[PDB]
């Protein structure tokens, strides 16, 4: 029938990150800390070692470009690839970092000549290869901020793919999102890949901070390099949808009590339920899936303190 086991640890961090970007490489947890308060800006690659984040390398030090770039990190079996991309132009200019231990990185300046994602809003995320027809692909996906008429010629979500570990971005994945509603802002679009199945987790609101309703669309593969998505209704009355992940081919949905996240509720297959109530809140709670039956739920209850909830789940 079912199995739920939850243990939690803490992680101290002596680097005050503006934004955290967790990832699991070779079954271990790493962070992509952005340190930007003589303002030496850093894009540190930290790693969890016992109960502390250990800084391994600064990617911004080895970077020609300025400003907070777009960070796209891809975690395949035998390597990490992280891209730092200048936002503002006809061509995109990225810096491609490669590592296979988590500490050693070797950058290479890349140029996405005449990119399609121009005009589309991009944002930083961690992803994993998506296999389509005997070929894995890394995805840089963008959304159209505002829509006023239903143009078919122009698709709302656009994805450029790379089947050479991020070296050349010439493939175009066609995303067909049939529920794109008019007048409102759409932001923080990040794809969710699992079991070689594609989905997108984005926000729909009035402003990046004013209104932030979480949306989730699951896509099916219609034909060669073309996907067609539809919305997934995770709405629970008197609860705020926060993160969505999958364990055991079942959704793991995070909800808050209000938009202040004093308490979080985690639902498994909607069949089972647990409560996260930081003794501080659970704001910014995210699932960092480790395995098909194990995920992490991380939020920071203070500056420098991370709460690492480890969740084990299995259904039969």
């Amino acid at each position: 029938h079912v199995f739920i086991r939850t243990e939690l640890s803490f992680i101290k961090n002596n680097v005050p990150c503006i934004r955290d970007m967790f990832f699991i490489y070779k079954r271990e947890l790493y962070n992509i800390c952005l340190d930007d308060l003589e303002d030496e800006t850093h894009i540190y690659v930290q790693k969890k070692v016992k109960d502390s984040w250990i800084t391994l390398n600064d990617l911004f030090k080895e970077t020609d470009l300025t400003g907070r770039p777009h960070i796209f990190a891809y975690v395949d079996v035998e390597e990490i690839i992280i891209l730092l991309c200048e936002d503002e132009k006809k061509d995109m200019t990225c810096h491609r970092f490669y590592s296979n231990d988590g500490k050693e990185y070797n950058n290479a300046e890349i140029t996405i000549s005449d990119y399609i994602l121009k005009d589309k809003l991009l944002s930083s995320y961690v992803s994993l290869p998506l296999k389509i027809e005997n070929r894995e692909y890394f995805l840089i996906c963008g959304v159209s901020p505002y829509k006023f008429k239903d143009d078919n010629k122009k698709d709302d979500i656009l994805c450029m793919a790379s089947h050479d570990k991020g070296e050349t971005w010439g493939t175009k994945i066609v995303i067909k999102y049939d529920n794109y509603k008019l007048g409102v802002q759409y932001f923080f679009l990040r794809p969710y890949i699992s079991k070689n199945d594609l989905s997108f987790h984005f926000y729909v609101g009035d402003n990046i901070n004013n209104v932030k309703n979480v949306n989730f669309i699951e896509c099916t593969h219609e034909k060669d390099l073309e996907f067609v998505c539809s919305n997934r209704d995770f709405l629970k009355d008197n609860k705020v949808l926060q993160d969505v992940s999958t364990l055991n081919d079942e959704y793991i949905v995070s909800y808050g009590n209000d938009n202040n996240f004093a308490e979080c509720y985690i639902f498994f297959n909607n069949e089972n339920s647990i409560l996260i109530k930081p003794e501080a809140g659970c704001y910014g709670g995210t699932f960092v899936k480790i395995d098909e039956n194990r995920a992490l739920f991380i939020y920071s209850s203070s500056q420098g303190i991370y709460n690492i909830h480890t969740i084990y789940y299995a259904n039969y």
């Epitope: 070692v49 502390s52 250990i54 800084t55 391994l56």
Partner: antibody, heavy 125, light 103 residues
Framework: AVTLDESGGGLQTPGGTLSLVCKGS????????MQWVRQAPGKGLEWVAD????????GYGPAVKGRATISRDDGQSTVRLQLNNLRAEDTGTYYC??????????????????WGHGTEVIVSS | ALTQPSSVSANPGETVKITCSGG???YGWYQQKSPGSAPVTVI????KRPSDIPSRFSGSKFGSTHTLTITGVQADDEAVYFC?????????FGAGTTLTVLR
């Protein structure tokens, strides 16, 4: 009184192995990246190896790669450099060193803030 | 490799400047009066100085260049100063600079 004391430096056999121990005091050992730096007689300073917090990462100099082995007994506050197949090129004075930043392992030699007294090794028959 | 000067010289009380052109990451300076004797950290992070080291020592990293400055040199300031940074492959040291006090 952040101090480091080296031991095991003597006249080892060419072909044999070496074992240098660096005991640290005054600072919270285990929270800082440790390193080994040698100096051949007459020649300048040379990086040997470095060990990250909790031994998570282990790096070596090209001169000693595939021969040296750095380890840490965080309880005893010691760093052991175990260099095998000793060539005459290994002769010199070895100084262990502490990185200034805690929970920080960026690959650089600009962050050393504590140097050990230095033990002399002689590879000779 | 880190390009460090072979030797530099100055009279007592005069300000001196030593450079390091090679390398990518931040720079550090360690003095060593005699070979075999342990070096002493003079500056660790680009413009950071240990509590035991006197106020006359200062750093500055302008591009790939870092200059160690000794304002008002003294007799106990004679040593072979070394440059510490990272080379293309891994962490690396400079060739060494020998400072001589003019008398």
């Amino acid at each position: 009184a952040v101090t480091l004391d080296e031991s095991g430096g003597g006249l080892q056999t060419p072909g044999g192995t070496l074992s240098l121990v660096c005991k640290g005091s005054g600072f919270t050992f285990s929270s800082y990246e440790m390193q080994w730096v040698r100096q051949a007689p007459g020649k300048g300073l040379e990086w040997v190896a470095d060990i990250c917090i909790g031994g998570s990462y282990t790096g070596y100099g090209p001169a000693v790669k595939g021969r040296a082995t750095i380890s840490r007994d965080d309880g005893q506050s010691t760093v052991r450099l175990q260099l095998n197949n000793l060539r005459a090129e290994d002769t010199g004075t070895y100084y262990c060193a502490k990185t200034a930043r805690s929970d920080y392992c960026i690959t650089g030699l600009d962050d050393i803030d504590a140097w050990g007294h230095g033990t002399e090794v002689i590879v000779s028959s | 490799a880190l390009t460090q000067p072979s030797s530099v010289s100055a009279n007592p009380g005069e300000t001196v400047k030593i450079t390091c052109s090679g390398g990518s990451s931040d720079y550090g300076w360690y003095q060593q009066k005699s070979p075999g004797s342990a070096p002493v950290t003079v500056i660790y992070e680009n413009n950071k100085r240990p509590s035991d080291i006197p106020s006359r020592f200062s750093g500055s990293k302008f591009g790939s260049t870092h200059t160690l400055t000794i304002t008002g040199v003294q007799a106990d300031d004679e040593a072979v100063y070394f440059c510490g940074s990272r080379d293309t492959n891994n962490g690396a040291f400079g060739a060494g600079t020998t400072l001589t006090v003019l008398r």
